[PDB]
């Protein structure tokens, strides 16, 4: 039976509909032209009404009356004011809260397939690509490790204000790519133009060595935009009359974003994850527990999005089974060297120009399979605590309360303590449920990519030592090129085709593949499918890929 | 249709004019993707001129030099434009198709 809240929401919507265009006009005008606080509340009201409007009447009015275009066009005026907020002594944060309310409302409109189309028609991505505030990334001063300025708790740091500006723009871009399934190429093309307009800032995010929660959220959103926007088919069907020079620059930026996204798998898909999570346990025991769960979620989301990108690149470049793009080198050695407890080898920073090894995919698969059981047990314990909250020890209720309210948890009523404890348990359950879904998706996608690379290297790769020396002499002879000139303009950029794989590399891949994908990992992967995939309608995909990979690794080449 | 000797050159010039990148007021194309296509098209025009493709017809050669934004040939065609602001817009079309509002005064002057 229809829940009482859904009945009341429908009946409330019918009352909004009875006041018609007069109410719509007042709220839309106050959202565009009102005073600072009035604009913020009118935009929050529009976010709420459009969230319940199943018939999209308010969205149709906002588009047809041009208010949606005025709200988008005013982002260029906000840019001038938002730049002034990045100064060490900002003016009043009023423009930031108006921008947040505006971007939250546009993000809400972008959740419907129709609203994403109307936002692309109003030019939202084009106006975002014109805003210079995104290029004003504050330099993180590394010398603040020497103490004694109590930063006054009331003004967010310039880096945090920059994130309050950038994260909503990235969220809209990611949402438009997710909701626009019928116009995916035009949406992807405009979002690519935004990524190219701010390409230095985007490369700075992708290169960031910081382990802060904010830098991980920037990386998680940006990798999820690149995974959806940077599709090879978007460049060939953009009938936008770009001169040949501008297409070469566009391909150049995409090829850099690609290499940098793949380099993130080496950082977050490996042993360095455990060291980044441990180096922050020492500086504050009371504020650290919530930030750890969200950092862990953001790191898993980065790995998921880069694996989604690898999957999408393999699906689109394969109209035929013989033409697989090889994203990973045929080495598994990296998976075997990282199981050892040796803490003291100096960082071989692999340069961002080397392709990751297939060993990284197997290590990520093993790690995601282990983390799945840990998240499953914590999720089950947290659900049991939520059912029995009134039976919890007062010390556990205090720990749950202090995590949502650091100041003053001792002055609140017992009823308020149980309410804070329930909220923390629900956040914990939902965060762990998302980690379980990400681990399942990473496992599925790692198995797919591993299967496709083993299929290519074991069945389709021509080795550099097969056939044969017959005829032609000619001699001579050493020396030196310095200098000089001339044009031939036929550099077709299809030259990613020369990784000379040796027969020794393939034989090592077969032997290391059988050892690294052993019966213990295969059993755990089948146990995960039995615990998780029974309840969500994808029966047998993990079992099918495990059988195919087991097939390929048992083929002795005849 | 009339000139059998000019027909090969007319086909090259028709193809250059047909392939010319145009901006559209509702395209998903970025200004950078447009600039790259426009540069590649301009290199195709320049290659045809350097190869002497039009050397038997001064008028087709002049039209190809106009497509390259040749300022001497644009000024030789002053009488067809009649105004300096038509000359400005022709220069912007063939040299600076991605011109910004902030740069207009410099090009106008």
Curated annotation (Swiss-Prot), chain B:
Top-rank taxon: Eukaryota
Subcellular location: Nucleus, Nuclear pore complex; Nucleus membrane
Family: Belongs to the nucleoporin Nup85 family.
Subunit structure comment from the entry: Component of the nuclear pore complex (NPC).
Function, as annotated: Component of the nuclear pore complex (NPC) that seems to be required for NPC assembly and maintenance. Involved in nephrogenesis.
UniProt name for this protein: Nuclear pore complex protein Nup85
Organism (species): Xenopus laevis (African clawed frog)
Gene giving rise to this polypeptide: nup85
């Amino acid at each position: 039976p229809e829940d009482v809240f859904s009945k009341l929401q429908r009946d409330n919507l019918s009352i909004f509909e009875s006041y018609g265009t007069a109410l719509m006009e007042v709220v839309c005008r106050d959202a565009c032209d009102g005073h600072d606080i009035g604009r913020m509340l009118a935009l929050a009201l529009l976010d709420r009404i459009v969230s319940v409007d199943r018939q999209q009447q308010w969205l149709l009015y906002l588009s047809n009356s041009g208010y949606l275009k005025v709200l988008v066009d005013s982002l260029a005026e906000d840019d001038v004011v938002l730049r002034n907020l990045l100064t060490p002594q900002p003016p009043l944060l009023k423009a930031l809260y108006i921008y947040e309310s505006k971007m939250a409302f546009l993000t809400r409109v972008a959740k419907s397939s129709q609203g994403a189309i109307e936002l692309l028609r109003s030019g939202v991505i084009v106006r975002l690509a014109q805003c210079q505030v995104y290029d004003m990334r504050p330099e993180t001063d590394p010398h603040g490790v020497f103490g004694m300025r109590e930063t006054p708790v009331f003004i967010p740091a310039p880096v945090e204000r920059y994130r309050q500006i950038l994260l909503p723009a990235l969220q809209i871009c990611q949402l438009i790519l997710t909701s626009s399934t019928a116009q995916h190429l035009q949406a992807a093309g405009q979002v690519l133009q935004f990524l190219v307009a701010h390409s230095d800032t985007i490369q700075a995010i992708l290169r960031s060595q910081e382990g802060s929660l904010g830098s991980l959220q920037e990386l998680a959103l940006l990798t999820g935009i690149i995974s959806k926007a940077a599709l090879p088919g978007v460049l060939n069907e953009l009938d936008i009359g770009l001169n040949d020079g501008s297409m070469m620059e566009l391909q150049g930026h995409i090829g850099r974003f690609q290499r940098q996204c793949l380099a993130l798998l080496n950082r977050f898909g490996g042993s360095d994850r455990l060291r980044q999570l441990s180096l922050q346990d020492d500086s504050s025991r009371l504020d650290g527990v919530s930030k750890k769960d969200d950092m862990e979620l953001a790191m898993q989301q980065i790995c998921s999005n880069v694996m989604e990108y690898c999957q999408a690149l393999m699906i689109q470049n394969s109209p035929s089974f013989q033409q697989t793009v090889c994203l990973f080198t045929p080495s598994l050695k990296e998976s075997a060297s990282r199981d050892g407890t040796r803490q003291d080898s100096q960082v071989s920073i692999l340069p961002s120009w080397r392709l990751p090894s297939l060993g990284v995919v197997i290590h990520l698969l093993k790690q995601s399979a282990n983390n799945f059981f840990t998240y499953y047990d914590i999720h089950r314990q947290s659900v049991g605590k939520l059912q029995n909250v009134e039976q919890l020890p007062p010390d556990e209720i205090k720990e749950l309360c202090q995590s949502e309210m650091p100041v003053g948890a001792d002055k609140i009523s017992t009823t308020q303590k149980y309410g804070l404890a329930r909220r923390r348990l629900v956040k914990l359950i939902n965060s762990r449920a998302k980690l379980l879904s990400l681990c399942s998706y990473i496992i599925e996608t790692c198995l797919y990519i591993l299967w496709r690379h083993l299929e290519y290297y074991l069945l389709h790769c021509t080795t550099s030592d097969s056939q044969d020396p017959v005829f032609s002499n000619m001699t001579f002879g050493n020396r030196r090129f310095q200098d000089t000139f001339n044009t031939d303009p036929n550099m077709d950029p299809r030259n990613l085709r020369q990784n000379k794989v040796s027969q020794q590399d393939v034989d090592t891949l077969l032997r290391e593949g059988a050892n690294s994908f052993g019966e213990s990992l295969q059993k755990r992967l089948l146990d995960i499918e039995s615990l998780y995939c029974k309840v969500r309608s994808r029966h047998s995909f993990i079992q099918a890929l495990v059988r195919r990979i087991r097939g390929l690794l048992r083929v002795s080449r005849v | 249709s009339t000139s059998a000797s000019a027909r090969s050159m007319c086909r090259v010039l028709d193809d250059l004019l047909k392939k010319m990148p145009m901006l559209h007021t509702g395209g998903t194309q970025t200004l950078t993707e447009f600039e790259l296509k426009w540069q590649h098209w301009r290199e195709e025009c320049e290659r045809h001129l350097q190869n002497g493709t039009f050397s038997s017809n001064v008028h087709m050669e002049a039209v190809c030099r106009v497509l390259l934004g040749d300022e001497e040939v644009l000024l030789e065609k002053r009488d067809l434009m009649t105004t300096w602001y038509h000359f400005l817009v022709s220069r912007l079309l063939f040299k600076h198709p991605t011109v910004k509002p902030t740069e207009l005064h410099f090009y106008a002057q």
